[PDB]
Design a protein around this ligand. Structure first.
Ligand SMILES: *[C@@H]1O[C@H](CO)[C@@H](O)[C@H](O)[C@H]1NC(C)=O
Ligand SMILES: *[C@@H]1O[C@H](CO)[C@@H](O)[C@H](O)[C@H]1NC(C)=O
Ligand SMILES: *[C@@H]1O[C@H](CO)[C@@H](O)[C@H](O)[C@H]1NC(C)=O
Ligand SMILES: *[C@@H]1O[C@H](CO)[C@@H](O)[C@H](O)[C@H]1NC(C)=O
Ligand SMILES: *[C@@H]1O[C@H](CO)[C@@H](O)[C@H](O)[C@H]1NC(C)=O
Lengths: 337, 342, 341, 340, 344
């Protein structure tokens, strides 16, 4: 018999097979083993709070009416037509935290459908989902975001459809590196929710949690060094000859203005959130230090307009300010890792 | 008893059911008790006067020619793919700028049929709705954003919408908005708007939104106060070093005006005036007045007991500025935090 | 007797009605009366030279084959799914960068058949119509944007479009625009454009949009007025306080150039001069004139030899000419652009 | 006599007309005369090197299987929906980053069948074609953006494209562009490109575009000249104060650099040196020379009759710089307006 | 004899041919030879790390079920609409953020069937392929972007892909890029990646792009050189005009930190340090060290008197050392990054 004969016998519009009936109707619920392969990860945006992931979703279940006829033999798995993949019964599935998704279809539909002898059918399809993960920014430059995937069935109550993760390696990623992050391959927490909506029963939902650690190199080489250099410039201003206004005043004012502009530029790009973060705290502390230098010079000038007393105060401040800056830096770095 | 035969006899080809005709044709209008579950909420930007939501919209209605008695089970769940063979009520959102279904691995919808004929039909949507924004007091505004449900293909004589008696609109647990906070209480009204072609039914639910200002505090109010106080310190040093003080005045004025330009350019265009604009304008006026007073001091100092007069006016304004700034700040704060709204 | 039987007999498979053939074929042209209800209006962006609209387009015509007698009721709403099996007149908007339908939980379309044979067909659309803009006087311009309705596949001998006698285009109550006002009066004209393949019917509706100047006034004109008053006060200072006057001149210059940069970067590239550009250029020229007069006064005071008296006299004369010049320029500009232009 | 019967007998099921095979199969190649009507033009973004158009593309060909004689009328117009069962010649645009049809209340198509068998097929499209751009002289450039109509599914042995005899492409009355002038003259050429899969027909049209000088001139060309005039006036000072003179020098530098940076950032990347870059660089050099003159006057002011030498050098600079700018301005304008 | 009837007998209703069963079923895996013609190239954005192509992807394979002998002509250029009725090998690009067909006035396809059964299937595509892009030396980097053609629904035991022996990738004449240039040599590799569901075939082509540094040089390197030269010239002045020295140093620092901050705006936030970062940081540190030296010498001058001399000697030593140190650093960095590290 040709492959057409067996294919029609196992499923066809002519044969007694109805796609509109789930397996084991009026019986035990069908459990679906879900497996995810991440082809590409990244493009995580802080402003929109969402990331794009290319995932090869894989699911298999038990279909008694799909059992391979005894005529066929010699292959443990029989590949079938991705066009006919629409004909068979499907487990309805959707992503709860999904802004949008886009099916891939280039030169053909991107779906693979294996059928085994015992009746198991494996469906693997290529997806491009854009999940949103609410990310906390209490400590912004160094933080561990937890962006999550929530697979979930919709059209079937948990008494009919149930999702279970694969026993061995249910999420596989092949050496993917985000531009600014470091995904922990080993530390991928699992668990299932089975969210319950009032008046509509229980819907099963498996879940994946990713632990994304943000790299701090760009921000350390981006803002921290220029800010340190600005404060060192203010200290250099302090070392400049006092009771000579003309040199002193522009240095302090320009330091303060440069720091303010740096803070505005580095806070404009980040998403607007209510709570305070680490970057703005550091910037405002440095700005207050520059302000302190300016008011110290003002005190020196008003004391001058006795010279030993003004010089003594200037020397005391010039010795104290590096120390308090060092103490603030130590306590801030220790507190905020 | 065969499930395929039962489905065929219920609404299949051999059933005789027609999906092109509303239930109980030529009679009382079919009522729909729709309720909406919100899943996501955010991306609400005042720049283009819109916001986006993810809703689990569910509709219930009767259908006498669809009740069944063969299967003892009552809440018989059927697949979404069959939903094209059953009549559905027309429904769309009036204040909608654009929306689309969700089609991932299947079609996102659910249909259930009860013994008495009631039908539940929940179809997923993502609405980029629009509501007018009132920015009279922008940084501390309370905004009411609305969504509207109404039918198009049927008049009131054929289709009547209404909310659900208990828990009409719900919110997913732990929902967080990026910038605002959603007040728990939500208003429900009947728009029932009329056109020239008939009286189309309509249903409206109002969301009360309040904005947290702390981010605006940190990013906009503290820097302006710091710049103004820097101008204060600029004034503190005497007039002996005129060029340095005057150059610092120019640079502080330039930075303050660029801050004002950025503040006004970060927000869309509106004819009236907003609170942030008033605050920035008054603070710019304060720094301008400080520069003008320093210029007056220099004018008096430059050529008698004239230096005494210059010092006296300097001290007088150094004492007068704190009272003015404090009274303006406290008055603005109290009026825009209590008196103007709530 | 069954309603399904009636629907099938009217336009169904057994009806014999052919939707691919124009009504009154090989005879007088069909007569379509269309009126449009505007639902939303906004997103008027002059950078892309277009605007977005949201309309309830409604069309009515006559089909002699759709006359029915089984149901005594005349106004008979039908399922929108039958709209694909009934003749629908061609209608495309001539000037629209991109338009799309609206589908949510169904297709947003309404179809209705009356007893005599008249058909109603209301459909919801969103159009990104494009209207060229004239920005000769940008802050206080009056814009007229055009919506053109016309057919594509039918010659004037076959399909004729025309407005409705009463309430041709009706605006939704309470509609507001972020930065514009809509006048109640609207103009209706027939474009009836001629192509090389034949004469195609066309229908044109014009909206008179004017721009309120409140935001632009507050953002641009008031800061410049404050800057020039600051320059005035700088002028009032005698030349012996040279650093004060010179620094005040610098702050005037820099404020004016930043304002100019913002104004010129806020608008699309256009060859001709606009009112805001002329006004701000004159403000910059006045600031430059203040700098020039200060420099001339300082030069005169440099190399007492009865030169201080003449320098003071010329400073007073110029500081009394500056207010007259600025006031006359402002009043002239305002009157010409508010009445003459 | 019934129109439905005629439609069925011509394109319908009982007709036997197979729209799946080209006319004159195993015979001479059918020739197509296509003419394009331009409706909307603009949005020529130099950053991404593309422009968008709205064309009423029209095609004709002689199909012997569509001849009819029952209807006395010749130009028997047909409903656009019949186009699914009529042989539509393949045609795609070689250079287009993206194009789409247009549907509003219907599909924007037109079909017309004549007695002799000729068929007119008009369709409205929106195309964001891409044209590489040359910026060797940016503000005064004359550009040539291109459109290529060509077949994809038929060797030149089967399908041949050619323009119309007269009025091949006509622009709609009142057509305008935001910043360009579309001159009347348009060039038509035979493209006829080659591939390893055979010989493919290809039809090409070229649009000549030039950039209007009003906006760029009014926006920056006058202000830089006025700033340099201010510097020239500043060459008549006798060193009244040092920091004030320094600030007066720096302000012109700031205006200069803001204008130059804005104009340089308004453009995409080109490796060669352009007109506006040359102008900004020479303005930079001249204002820097003004600053150097300020520094030299400050230096020679300090300690011989050095005062007379300082005044002589100051008047030499004040008499040299304006003439140098005048000669540079006239030279640059003439070369990059006529000789380039 | 009717061509329509011949098409029906070949693949139509009366043919009996099925479009769902691959050729040579239950036999050797059918091999597919594919070649790619490039029509467009560009829009290489470093921020999102992707580039857009426009390719005429062609595929060939043998099929005994499509062998005809009635028509004497060897090649039958058939209508593109037939392609839904014949078997088509699945072929998706492994790395692409988004791809779509091109449909204008028709679907852009073609069908040409030879007598022996060979089938030469081509299609027009627009791919936004993503290629990972290192920037160890951002302005002088040689990038390798890749395209991975591979089957999805078929194991390598059924479908095998391989490049054409001659002329595997063709490039349209006159192709230019806004900021790069395509070298003539293109590598061809067999990825043949393994999954948990089998051993899938894969085909990879490597693009070598070298970046032209004209814009980076002109717009960024020259301003830095002018800035440091102006810093030297300002420092050459004596200590009498001390406020002028301080103001010039401050404005140099301000403009150069503005340049450095604006340098990184157009590039992705990368943890590692690139050439532009090194150059800007080193030159800004040079200006800062000049300011530090000026402050130290001023401290020396702050109480002829065996101090004015010292200060002048230190200033002259700095004037003789700073330009030489800057020049030696410049030559060392340029030669190392031109020859020793990368490129050339
Ligand atoms: C899913 O959660 C439900 C909660 O009732 C539990 O019974 C079930 O075991 C969970 N599934 C897995 C795979 O852990
Ligand atoms: C539906 O609800 C409306 C409104 O209360 C009521 O008038 C009507 O009788 C109800 N049922 C039917 C079958 O029309
Ligand atoms: C529509 O207009 C035409 C042309 O004026 C007229 O002859 C005709 O009677 C009108 N009505 C119909 C139904 O054709
Ligand atoms: C069509 O034009 C071609 C090219 O000139 C010519 O060879 C051919 O004879 C023409 N007519 C037909 C019917 O093919
Ligand atoms: C195709 O190539 C493969 C791999 O070399 C070979 O085994 C096979 O015989 C070839 N031909 C066919 C018809 O599969």
């Amino acid at each position: 018999v040709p492959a057409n004969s067996t294919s029609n016998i196992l499923n066809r519009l002519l044969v007694s097979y109805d796609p509109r009936i789930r397996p084991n109707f009026k019986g035990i619920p069908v459990d679906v083993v879900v497996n995810i392969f991440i082809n590409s990860f990244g493009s995580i945006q802080e402003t929109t709070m969402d990331y794009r992931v290319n995932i090869f979703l894989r699911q298999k279940w038990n279909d008694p009416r799909l059992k391979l006829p005894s005529d066929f033999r010699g292959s443990d798995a029989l590949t079938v037509d991705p066009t006919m993949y629409k004909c068979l019964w499907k487990p309805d599935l959707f992503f709860a935290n999904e802004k949008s998704a886009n099916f891939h279809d280039v030169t053909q539909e991107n779906i693979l459908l294996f059928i085994f002898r015992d009746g198991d059918v494996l469906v693997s399809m290529r997806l491009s989902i854009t999940l949103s993960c609410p990310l906390d920014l209490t400590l912004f430059p160094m933080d561990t975001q937890r962006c999550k995937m929530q697979l979930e069935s919709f059209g079937y109550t948990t008494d009919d459809l149930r999702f279970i993760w694969q026993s061995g390696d249910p999420v596989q990623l092949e050496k993917i590196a985000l531009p600014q992050f470091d995904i922990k391959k080993e530390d991928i927490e699992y668990g299932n929710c089975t969210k319950y909506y009032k008046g509509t029963g229980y819907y099963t939902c498996v879940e994946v949690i990713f632990t994304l650690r943000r790299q701090v190199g760009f921000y350390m080489m981006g803002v921290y060094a220029p800010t340190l250099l600005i404060v060192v410039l203010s200290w250099l201003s302090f070392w400049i000859n006092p009771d000579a206004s003309a040199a002193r005043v522009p240095l302090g004012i320009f330091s303060v203005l440069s720091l303010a502009s740096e803070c505005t530029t580095l806070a404009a790009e980040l998403p607007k959130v209510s709570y305070v973060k680490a970057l703005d705290v550091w910037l405002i502390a440095c700005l207050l230090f520059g302000f302190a230098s300016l008011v110290e010079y003002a005190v020196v000038q008003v004391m001058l307009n006795i010279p030993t007393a003004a010089k003594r105060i200037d020397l005391y401040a010039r010795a104290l300010f590096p120390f308090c800056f060092l103490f603030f830096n130590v306590i801030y770095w220790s507190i905020y890792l | 008893m065969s499930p395929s035969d039962f489905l065929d006899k219920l609404m299949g080809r051999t059933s005789g059911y027609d999906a092109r005709i509303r239930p109980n044709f030529k009679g009382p209008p079919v009522n729909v008790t729709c309720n909406i579950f919100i899943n996501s909420f955010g991306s609400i930007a005042e720049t283009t006067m819109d916001y986006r939501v993810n809703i689990f919209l569910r509709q219930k209605w009767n259908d006498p020619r669809l009740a069944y008695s063969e299967y003892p089970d009552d809440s018989l769940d059927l697949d979404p793919s069959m939903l094209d063979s059953i009549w559905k009520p027309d429904l769309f959102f009036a204040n909608e700028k654009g929306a689309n279904f969700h089609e991932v691995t299947t079609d996102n919808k659910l249909l259930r049929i009860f013994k008495n004929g009631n039908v539940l039909y929940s179809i997923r949507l993502t609405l980029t709705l629009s509501c007018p924004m009132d920015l009279k007091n922008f940084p501390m505004d309370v905004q009411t954003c609305i969504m509207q449900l109404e039918s198009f293909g049927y008049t009131m004589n054929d289709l009547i919408f209404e909310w659900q008696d208990e828990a009409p609109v719900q919110v997913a647990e732990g929902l967080t908005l990026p910038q605002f906070l959603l007040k728990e209480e939500k208003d429900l009204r009947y728009c029932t708007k009329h056109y020239n072609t008939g009286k189309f039914t309509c249903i409206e639910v109002r969301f009360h939104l309040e904005r947290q200002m702390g981010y605006y505090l940190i990013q906009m109010y503290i820097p302006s106060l710091l710049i103004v106080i820097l101008s204060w310190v600029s004034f503190w040093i005497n007039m002996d070093a005129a060029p340095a003080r005057v150059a610092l005045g120019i640079t502080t004025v330039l930075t303050m005006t660029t801050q004002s330009s950025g503040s006004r350019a970060s927000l869309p265009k509106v004819s009236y005036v907003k609170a942030i604009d008033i605050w920035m304008a008054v603070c710019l006026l304060f720094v301008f007045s400080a520069l003008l007073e320093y210029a007056a001091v220099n004018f008096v100092s430059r050529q008698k007991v004239f230096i005494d007069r210059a010092k006296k006016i300097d001290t007088i304004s150094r004492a007068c500025f704190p009272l003015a700034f404090l009274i303006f700040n406290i008055f603005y704060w109290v009026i825009y935090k209590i008196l103007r709204h709530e």
